[PDB]
Amino acid sequence: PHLSXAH
Amino acid sequence: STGSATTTPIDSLDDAYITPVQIGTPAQTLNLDFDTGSSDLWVFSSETTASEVXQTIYTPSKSTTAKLLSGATWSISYGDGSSSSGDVYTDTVSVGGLTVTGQAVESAKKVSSSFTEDSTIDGLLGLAFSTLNTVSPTQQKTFFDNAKASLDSPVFTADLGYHAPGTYNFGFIDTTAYTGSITYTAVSTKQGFWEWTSTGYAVGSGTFKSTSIDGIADTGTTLLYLPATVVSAYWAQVSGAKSSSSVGGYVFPCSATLPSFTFGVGSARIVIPGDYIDFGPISTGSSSCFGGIQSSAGIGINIFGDVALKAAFVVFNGATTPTLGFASK
Numbered sequence: 016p017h018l019s020x021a022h
Numbered sequence: 023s024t025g026s027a028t029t030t031p032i033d034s035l036d037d038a039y040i041t042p043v044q045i046g047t048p049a050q051t052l053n054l055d056f057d058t059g060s061s062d063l064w065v066f067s068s069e070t071t072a073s074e075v076x077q078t079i080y081t082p083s084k085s086t087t088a089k090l091l092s093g094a095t096w097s098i099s100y101g102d103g104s105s106s107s108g109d110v111y112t113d114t115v116s117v118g119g120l121t122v123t124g125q126a127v128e129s130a131k132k133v134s135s136s137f138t139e140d141s142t143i144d145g146l147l148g149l150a151f152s153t154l155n156t157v158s159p160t161q162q163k164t165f166f167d168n169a170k171a172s173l174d175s176p177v178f179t180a181d182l183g184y185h186a187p188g189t190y191n192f193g194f195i196d197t198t199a200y201t202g203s204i205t206y207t208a209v210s211t212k213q214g215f216w217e218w219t220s221t222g223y224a225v226g227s228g229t230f231k232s233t234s235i236d237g238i239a240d241t242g243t244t245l246l247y248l249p250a251t252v253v254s255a256y257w258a259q260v261s262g263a264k265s266s267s268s269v270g271g272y273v274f275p276c277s278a279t280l281p282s283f284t285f286g287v288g289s290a291r292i293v294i295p296g297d298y299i300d301f302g303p304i305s306t307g308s309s310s311c312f313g314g315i316q317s318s319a320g321i322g323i324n325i326f327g328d329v330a331l332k333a334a335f336v337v338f339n340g341a342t343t344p345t346l347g348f349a350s351k
Contacts, residue, residue, distance in 0.1 A: 016032075016033065016035070016037040016038075016140070017037060017102075017244050017245070018037055018038045018055070018102070018242060018243065018244050019100065019101035019102040019242070019243050019244070019321075019325075019327075020038070020055060020057035020058065020059045020060065020100070020101075020146075020240050020241050020242005020243045020327070021059070021060040021061070021062070021098055021099065021100055021101075021150075021154050021156070022099070022100070022101050022322075
C-alpha cells in the first residue's frame with residue numbers, strides 16, 4: 016500500500 | 023470549545039492513519055483518514071455501489087439530523103489516481119468531543135478500486151483550504167473552517183506517531199506534546215494547500231545546505247517527496263542504495279543503518295530519524311527495503327508526507343493569515 020492524498 | 027481524538031496507523035508500515043469521527047444522530051462512527059492535502063469530507067455510505075463496498079458505512083436515513091443538500095454533487099481524484107463521487111448531505115459531525123452542526127457530508131455513490139480494497143479507511147476528512155472542495159455548484163466548508171467560530175483558538179495540531187498511535191487536537195496546543203519552541207513559518211494559499219518553504223536540508227552529520235524548498239504539508243501522503251538532486255544527495259550516503267524502476271523508487275538493503283535527514287523551518291531544524299526512512303521490505307522477508315524519501319520530479323510538487331510529519335509536532339494555525347508551526351517531539 017502507499018497513499019498520496021487533490022492534485 | 024476544544025477537541026481531542028486519537029489517530030492510529032492502519033498498518034505496520036504507517037502507510038496512513040485513520041481517526042474515529044462521529045456522524046449524525048444518533049452518532050454513527052467511522053474511521054476516516056484526516057487529509058491536510060485535500061478539502062473534502064467524504065465517506066462510504068448506504069448509497070455506495072455494493073460491489074464497490076468491501077468499510078464501515080454512513081447511512082443518511084438512519085440519522086435524524088441529516089438533510090439532503092439539494093442539487094449538490096461532488097467528484098474527486100487524488101494524487102495517485104484514486105477517485106470518488108456522489109451527492110451531499112449536511113449533518114452533525116464530532117471529532118474527539120468537538121461537535122459541528124450542518125457540516126457537509128459527501129455521500130459516496132461510487133469509489134475507485136483502491137478505496138474498495140482498503141478495508142481500514144471508511145472515508146476522508148479534508149483539512150486543506152476550502153477552495154479545493156469539489157462540491158458543485160457551491161463549495162462546502164471543511165470541518166476546521168466550520169468549527170473555527172467555536173474553537174478556543176483557530177488552530178489544529180497533528181501529532182502522528184512512528185509505528186504508534188498519536189493525536190489530532192483542535193482549539194489548543196498541548197505544550198507537553200513537544201520539545202523546545204514552535205517555529206512558525208508563512209503559508210501560501212494560492213494553491214489551496216498548506217504550502218510553505220523549507221530553509222534547507224542536512225544529511226546525517228553533514229552540512230546544512232541552505233536552499234529553498236517549496237512544498238506542502240500533506241497528512242494524506244505517506245512518503246517525503248523532494249527534488250531529484252536533494253534525494254540523490256541523501257541516498258549516495260547509503261552504500262547499498264540504488265534506484266529501481268521495478269519498485270519505482272530508491273531501494274536499499276534492509277540491514278542498512280540509515281542516516282538522518284534534516285529539513286529547515288526558519289532558523290529551526292527538524293531531524294527525521296534514520297529509522298523513519300526505512301519504510302519496509304519490498305515484500306515480506308525480502309533483503310531489500312523501500313526508501314522513505316523519493317524524488318518528486320514526476321509528481322510536480324514537493325510533498326512533506328507522514329514520514330517527515332511524524333518526526334515533528336505540527337501546528338496548523340488557521341488565523342486569517344495562516345501560519346505553520348513546527349516543534350520537535
